[PDB]
């Protein structure tokens, strides 16, 4: 009726969306290699004839928290965590290359090296890494080199077979896709395998969700949500009062 | 007074737009760099520091801006409607228009290039410099101009604004027309 | 419409993409307490002007009925 009902409704609806965005981070505190999503609000003015008094606010995801996660020491050979900044190249079920930070690796019955989510890990050849089937000792190098020991072979047979593809692009050019894999915003952009990133083998990288940061965002989203609801109530209260004009 | 490292921090938004509207500042730090637009309208600033680099637009309407030092770089436009500037220096990197309406401007540097419109409305300027090239419209309404330079390039329409033109350029490539 | 001249509230969000050289991000200078007062004041002022117009509407009607 006054268009301030919808101006406040559109703000209250967006505050719920930001609340859900923060809720996903808290639901994913223990997730491995999880980058917390950032939430903010953007002011978009309604340009047109009349006084510039109506400005909408909509929530967006400007970026992600690319800080180093909490490293968990597991003493497992097939667990690796990226030191500092970096990524691991994996292809999902669609055969589409995407960057990940989950270094919880495993070997299937055929020998292909996958991660906890089943994404095949790429290597030097840019093809999924395949290991000889009857292994005896698998050690992951600090730079990503994979050295294996054939079954029954003596100690002095630690030959390298593959090198884990570690990619360190600009963090501002990466977006989180629909399946948690970060990809270039510009499509058809090759992932250059960096040789500077290092793996801290024997440990797993946790999530970087700042629990306090989400909680203080929640309490501010609640108060701003409630204040706009009062604006909706006072908008209809004014409308009801301004109805006796035609009540002759 | 002057602008310090922390004085400017209180007038900057998330996109580096410096707003000094009616602030009692008289000068800016030497070698000043502003990421975004700079607004110094209605300010007692008399001279811009040398080496000023603006990533946006300049607005100094109704201000005391009188002197600009050479080497200043402006990515956008320079809006000086109603300032106190008397002379325009040579070598200013300007990517927009130069609005000098209601200014005491008298002289302009030779071979000046303006990438947009040029407004010298109500200015005591006596003669446009030879080699002046304007990529937009020309406004000379209410000015003291009565003689045009021999060669000038106005990509837009020249607006006389009332003053009588006694001499026309010999080499003039005009993309528009001439209006009184 | 004229914007308030209060300084923008600077917050230390150094890891934010929009952070400046010092890690500060700036946020609107909206103060909750004064905006709530405007909500109360504008609504009560709006409703009392309807009362005057409604009362003034009656006075015109009684003038029409004057004399008969």
């Amino acid at each position: 009726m006054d268009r301030a009902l919808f101006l406040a409704m559109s703000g209250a609806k967006q505050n719920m969306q930001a609340l859900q965005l923060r809720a996903n981070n808290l639901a994913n505190v223990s997730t491995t290699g999880f980058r917390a999503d950032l939430a903010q609000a953007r002011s978009m003015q309604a340009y047109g004839e009349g006084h510039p008094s109506r400005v909408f606010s909509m929530t967006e995801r400007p970026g992600h928290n690319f800080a180093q996660g909490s490293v968990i020491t597991t003493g497992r050979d097939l667990d690796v965590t990226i030191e500092g900044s970096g990524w691991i190249s994996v292809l999902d079920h669609t055969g589409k290359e995407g960057l990940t930070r989950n270094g919880n690796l495993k070997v299937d019955q055929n020998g292909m090296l996958t991660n906890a989510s089943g994404h095949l890990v790429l290597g030097e050849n840019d093809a999924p890494i395949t290991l000889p089937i009857p292994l005896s000792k698998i050690e992951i190098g600090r730079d990503g080199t994979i050295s294996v020991l054939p079954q029954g072979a003596p100690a002095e047979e630690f030959q390298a077979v593959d090198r884990i593809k570690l990619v360190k692009p600009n963090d501002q050019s990466l977006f989180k896709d629909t399946n948690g894999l970060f990809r270039h915003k510009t499509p058809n952009q090759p992932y250059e395998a960096d040789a500077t990133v290092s793996l801290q083998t024997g440990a797993i990288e946790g999530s970087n969700v700042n629990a306090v940061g989400e909680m203080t965002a929640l309490i501010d989203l609640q108060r701003q949500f409630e204040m706009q609801v009062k604006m909706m109530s006072t908008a209809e209260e004014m409308d009801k009062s301004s109805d006796s004009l035609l009540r002759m | 007074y002057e602008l310090d490292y922390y004085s400017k921090f209180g007038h900057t938004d998330n996109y580096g737009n410096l707003d000094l509207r009616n602030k009692p500042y008289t000068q800016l730090p030497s070698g000043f760099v502003v990421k975004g637009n700079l607004n110094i309208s209605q300010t007692p600033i008399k001279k811009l520091p040398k080496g000023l680099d603006v990533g946006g637009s300049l607005e100094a309407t109704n201000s005391a801006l009188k002197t600009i030092r050479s080497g200043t770089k402006i990515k956008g436009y320079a809006n000086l409607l109603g300032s106190k500037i008397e002379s325009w220096p040579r070598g200013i990197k300007l990517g927009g228009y130069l609005n000098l309406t209601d200014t005491p401007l008298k002289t302009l540097p030779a071979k000046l290039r303006v990438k947009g419109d040029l407004s010298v409305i109500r200015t005591p300027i006596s003669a446009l410099p030879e080699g002046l090239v304007v990529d937009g419209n020309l406004y000379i309404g209410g000015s003291a101009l009565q003689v045009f330079p021999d060669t000038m390039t106005v990509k837009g329409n020249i607006f006389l604004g009332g003053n009588k033109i006694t001499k026309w350029p010999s080499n003039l490539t005009l993309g528009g027309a001439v209006a009184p | 419409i004229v914007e308030s001249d209060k300084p923008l509230s600077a917050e230390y969000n150094p890891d934010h993409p929009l952070a400046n050289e010092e890690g500060y991000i700036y946020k609107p200078n909206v103060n909750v307490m004064e905006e709530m007062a405007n909500m109360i004041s504008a609504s009560r002022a709006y409703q009392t002007n309807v009362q005057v117009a409604d009362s003034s509407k009656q006075m015109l009607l009684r003038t029409l009925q004057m004399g008969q």
């Binding site: 340009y47 | 509207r21 637009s57 956008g76 228009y97 947009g116 937009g136 | 419409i1 004229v2 914007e3």
Partner: peptide
């Protein structure tokens, strides 16, 4: 008119020479 009043039109800006130049 009031000084410093906001305008109801997009704010002519920098990128896209189009605005930096046209008055």
């Amino acid at each position: 008119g009031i000084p410093g009043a906001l305008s109801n039109q997009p704010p002519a800006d920098a990128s896209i020479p189009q605005d930096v130049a046209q008055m």
